[PDB]
């Protein structure tokens, strides 16, 4: 399947055919040469986040090497992920959603942690906008309204993904008129 | 011109005089008034409308008298008033901070949240599950620090859908 | 030289006198009418709900007199205690005061997903408010939270503000989308 | 060896313990341009520019080419991937940045204005006060303060972030 190099907190896939493959087949990764490719027409490399890299490695799709060529194990990527509080949390949501058949992308353009699709960007009418929390997180109630604002032009609907101890559940939130 | 006058008990509101019989009979018909006892939130609402007097106190001064007098939450009161304005007929719910109303054959449970009073995300999830497991649609009413109300349905599920 | 009275109830002050309620909203856009979400000028009945932060400010400026429901006086220092005892309101107060003293109108940022919407003259008058997010300098953020702020302001002006406060002092970071 | 792969390289370089050294210039005007702009001096090529030129496919590091060479350089000299990606992006736009004095920064000059770019990465929190102090320091050095936020996938977003006493 694919080979990548670990550099920083990312994995780069530099082989063009592997890069086009991973992107085309499930919308993994982000081409560094173009922001929103038309289908598979980019050169790469494909940058995988640490979370994506762990997922793909553990699924047996990705082999990761360090720049000096020595192998990086799944347990090594797991350690990197678990040692970053944000990436640990995000990974548990990321994995749950991928396992359930969703495409999971960065929510950056939407102001959220994830943009989640049933088939992919430009294919779904609109992604589910997903905000990551621990159930122990305290929020002011107006933070829910802020989430409503972010989703106001996409779909007024949005998701909180709530995770602890590896488990995830979700709150589906939408504007309501009594 | 109050349609009825009431007084504040230690634990409730008691209608002492109905100036417009029709008015009280209707409050009885919809269930808020029974045997002289008027449900606290409905008493505050009727006062805010200028319809229920508390002694010679009228209008929002009387509403405030009820709210403070019985230790009601101002935001739950404002949300109750808003729902009543929309045509809903809520009651106080079982779970702390909630109201419950039935419309179109469906029961809605409204959790009232206020800016400046944080909650844990897990509490919101647990509340939503509980409402759902009682066959209530879970609605959250967020009141900001100026009194602006926003409503959302917030449904707890194991998988996005 | 407006003067108004209010009752402290929950974490709010209600101004039930219609003429006082109208004045406060008309002369500086203080408070929120409970009967009308966005009035046309002064056409509402109220009551006007003042936030605790607004009530402290107005009391301290000598404009507002607050009583409890039992009619006893709530002093400026009693409102200060209420505000200071709530971490969010304490922070917001310091920014609120600083902007009002500088001559801005300061309103809730609810509709914009922020802590404040700040105007030079008022809602509906300015082309667009400054959208202001409140922080302590000791707060940690992920860098993508700056991008989230940018998304919130993208429809407004993509030009938003972080108000940063500690020890009563406030300074601001004016942030705008940039193309190198 | 057998044959050295030089075709398609505009220059060839070697990686030493603290720098990239250009051993061959196959396109004279190419190296003269890198010298003119300041990145190449007496064979020594600035680390970020070496990584960038490798990423373009113009600089060969021995028999290592392209982004594989870019990585060799980033890993070999301990550069931050996100700083390199922002650097590349700025170069692609026609800017000519240098490594700034403050940790995590790039500086470049455009239109008679000097810009100071603080490179921030998703998953690495910072204190709001540090952002204010950095912006102040940049402005105090006559630089416009730009923040470059690189998300966890490599999407780059730029903002100007100016520290002031009063909104304006
Ligand atoms: Cl990701
Ligand atoms: Cl306010």
Curated annotation (Swiss-Prot), chain A:
The active site is at residues 117, 125, 156. Its EC number is 4.6.1.16. GO terms for biological process: tRNA splicing, via endonucleolytic cleavage and ligation. Pfam families: tRNA_int_endo, tRNA_int_endo_N. It comes from the Archaea. GO terms for molecular function: lyase activity; nucleic acid binding; tRNA-intron endonuclease activity. CDD domains: tRNA-intron_lyase_C. The keyword Methyltransferase does not apply. Keywords: Lyase, tRNA processing. SUPFAM superfamilies: tRNA-intron endonuclease catalytic domain-like (SSF53032), tRNA-intron endonuclease N-terminal domain-like (SSF55267). It catalyses: pretRNA = a 3'-half-tRNA molecule with a 5'-OH end + a 5'-half-tRNA molecule with a 2',3'-cyclic phosphate end + an intron with a 2',3'-cyclic phosphate and a 5'-hydroxyl terminus. InterPro entries: tRNA_endonuc-like_dom_sf, tRNA_intron_Endo_cat-like_sf, tRNA_intron_Endonuc_cat-like, tRNA_intron_Endonuc_N, tRNA_intron_Endonuc_N_sf, tRNA_splic, tRNA_splic_arch_short. One of its GO terms (cellular component) is cytoplasm. NCBIfam families: endA. Belongs to the tRNA-intron endonuclease family. Archaeal short subfamily. Endonuclease that removes tRNA introns. Cleaves pre-tRNA at the 5'- and 3'-splice sites to release the intron. The products are an intron and two tRNA half-molecules bearing 2',3' cyclic phosphate and 5'-OH termini. Recognizes a pseudosymmetric substrate in which 2 bulged loops of 3 bases are separated by a stem of 4 bp. Homotetramer; although the tetramer contains four active sites, only two participate in the cleavage. Therefore, it should be considered as a dimer of dimers. This is tRNA-splicing endonuclease. It comes from Aeropyrum pernix (strain ATCC 700893 / DSM 11879 / JCM 9820 / NBRC 100138 / K1).
């Amino acid at each position: 399947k694919a080979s990548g190099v670990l550099i920083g907190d990312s994995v780069l896939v530099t082989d063009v055919e592997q890069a086009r493959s991973l992107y085309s087949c499930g919308y993994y990764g982000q081409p560094l040469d173009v922001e929103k490719p038309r289908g598979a027409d980019f050169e790469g490399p494909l940058r995988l986040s640490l979370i994506e890299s762990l997922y793909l490695a553990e699924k047996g799709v990705l082999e990761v090497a360090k720049p000096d060529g020595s192998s990086v194990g799944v347990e090594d990527l797991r350690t990197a992920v678990r040692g970053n509080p944000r990436f640990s949390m995000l990974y548990n949501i990321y994995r749950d959603l991928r396992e359930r058949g969703f495409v999971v992308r960065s929510g950056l353009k939407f102001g959220s942690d994830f943009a989640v699709y049933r088939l992919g960007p430009g294919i779904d009418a609109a992604p589910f906008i997903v905000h990551a929390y621990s159930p122990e997180d305290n929020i002011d109630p107006v933070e829910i309204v802020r989430a409503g604002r972010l989703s106001h032009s996409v779909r007024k609907k949005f998701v909180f993904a709530v995770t602890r101890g590896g488990d995830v559940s979700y709150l589906m939130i939408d504007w309501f008129r009594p | 011109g109050c349609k009825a006058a009431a007084r504040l008990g230690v634990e409730g509101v008691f209608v002492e005089e109905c100036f417009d019989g029709s008015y009280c009979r209707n409050l009885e018909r919809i269930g808020y008034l029974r045997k002289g006892r008027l449900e606290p939130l409905e008493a505050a609402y009727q006062a805010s409308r200028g319809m229920l007097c508390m002694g010679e106190t009228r209008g929002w001064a009387a509403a405030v008298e009820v709210i403070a007098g019985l230790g009601l939450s101002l935001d739950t009161a404002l949300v109750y008033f808003d729902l009543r304005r929309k045509g809903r007929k809520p009651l106080v719910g079982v779970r702390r901070g909630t109201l419950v109303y039935e419309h179109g054959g469906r029961v809605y449970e409204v959790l009232v949240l206020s800016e400046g009073y944080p909650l844990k995300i897990g509490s919101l999830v647990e509340w939503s599950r509980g409402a759902s497991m009682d066959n209530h649609s879970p609605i959250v009413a967020i009141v900001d620090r100026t009194g602006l109300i926003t409503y959302y349905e917030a449904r707890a599920v194991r998988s996005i859908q």
